[PDB]
Design a protein around this ligand. Structure first.
Ligand code: NA
Length: 347
């Protein structure tokens, strides 16, 4: 176990500058077509090249001092009830985490696309809580020796898949059950002891969404140490410009006003109430609209800083694919594909 400062979440978040997601990488799943992938088969399954320290070096040089490492464990988790995590996968995750930690950066490690089993209903609650404890015990034990620069995030976007309001707050039952899942995660990490007793921990709302219904029903977990919990909100806003592939590519003054209200709501919901909050995912799709995204990006970061809210770009290394093109660092050439946009978010 390494020497660790006893920092509050607010103090830790003030040392972050801006963050970068290693997207569509260790979070890639193959569930429907390749059971039991080896670590490399998963990491490359969605088209990204295998990750290198040189990549993270470049992220740091670009002005980011924090990397979120989204990790999907489902394809690497054994049968119930032991839910043994494949040793080779745990080893590879640790290698990538070390690319960040060895760069003196902050690192956020989570569980990501677990929705096949992580279902927020009363019927599933006991079974899901049992598996959360099984896997977070393994993960927290492997990484317990790390200092304050490593943050555990208990879940990504827990939600009611298939429900008419899946992406609209679900139902009250789902929002309340997610409170139990967040509490189990905190309980499981703290029980491993050591540095994990005072590590900062991140928890999402329903779908990591900030809205009246997800905020109203949210219950901050009870903890065994003071001021170590952080809420993660994902906010690809304004929606029509930043997230909707069939929405406008123009960014207007009205969009600036909407962004002001949206990020203000994140602050008023959590930071204004003594709950530290981070925007763990944000971005704007490539719509062949560099001038629009530059104006969007300058205003997003300006407003975020005015509420002291840190932001983490979702970088999925996709530029002109058939899908969501949120790439920023071209991993194939180790070059920034849209340097104007990087500068807009670093100024
Ligand atoms: Na599995």
């Amino acid at each position: 176990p390494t020497q660790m400062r006893d920092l509050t979440a607010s103090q830790l978040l003030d040392e972050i500058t801006i963050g970068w997601n290693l997207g569509n990488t260790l979070d890639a799943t193959t569930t429907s077509w390749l059971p039991n992938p080896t670590p490399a088969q998963s990491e490359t399954a969605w088209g990204c090249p295998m990750t290198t320290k040189a990549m993270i070096d470049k992220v740091k040089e670009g002005g980011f001092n924090t990397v979120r490492v989204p990790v999907s464990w489902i394809d690497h988790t054994g049968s119930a009830p032991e839910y043994q995590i494949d040793e080779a996968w745990m080893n590879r995750v640790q290698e990538v985490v070390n690319y960040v930690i060895d760069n003196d950066m902050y690192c956020i490690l989570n569980i990501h696309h677990e929705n096949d089993w992580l279902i927020p209903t009363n019927a599933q609650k006991d079974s899901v809580n049992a598996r959360l404890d099984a896997i977070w015990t393994q993960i927290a034990t492997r990484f317990g020796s790390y200092d304050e620069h490593l943050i555990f995030e208990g879940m990504n976007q827990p939600r009611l898949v298939g429900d008419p309001n899946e992406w609209n707050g679900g139902n009250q039952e789902a929002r309340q059950v997610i409170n139990s899942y967040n509490q189990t995660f905190v309980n499981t990490v703290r029980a491993t002891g050591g540095n994990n007793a005072i590590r900062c921990l991140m928890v999402p709302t329903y779908a990591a969404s900030c809205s009246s219904t997800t905020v109203n029903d949210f219950v901050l977990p009870t903890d065994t140490v003071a001021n170590k919990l952080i809420v993660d909100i994902h906010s690809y806003s304004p929606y029509n410009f930043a997230l909707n592939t069939s929405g406008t590519s123009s960014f207007t003054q009205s969009d600036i006003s909407q962004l002001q209200w949206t990020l203000q709501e994140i602050y008023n919901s959590f930071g204004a109430k003594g709950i530290p909050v981070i925007i763990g995912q944000f971005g704007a799709l490539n719509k062949n609209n560099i001038n629009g995204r530059v104006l969007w990006g300058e205003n997003y970061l300006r407003i975020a800083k005015s509420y002291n809210i840190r932001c983490i770009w979702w970088d999925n290394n996709a530029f002109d694919t058939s899908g969501e093109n949120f790439g920023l660092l071209n991993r194939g050439t180790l070059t920034w594909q849209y340097p104007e946009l990087l500068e807009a978010m670093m100024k």
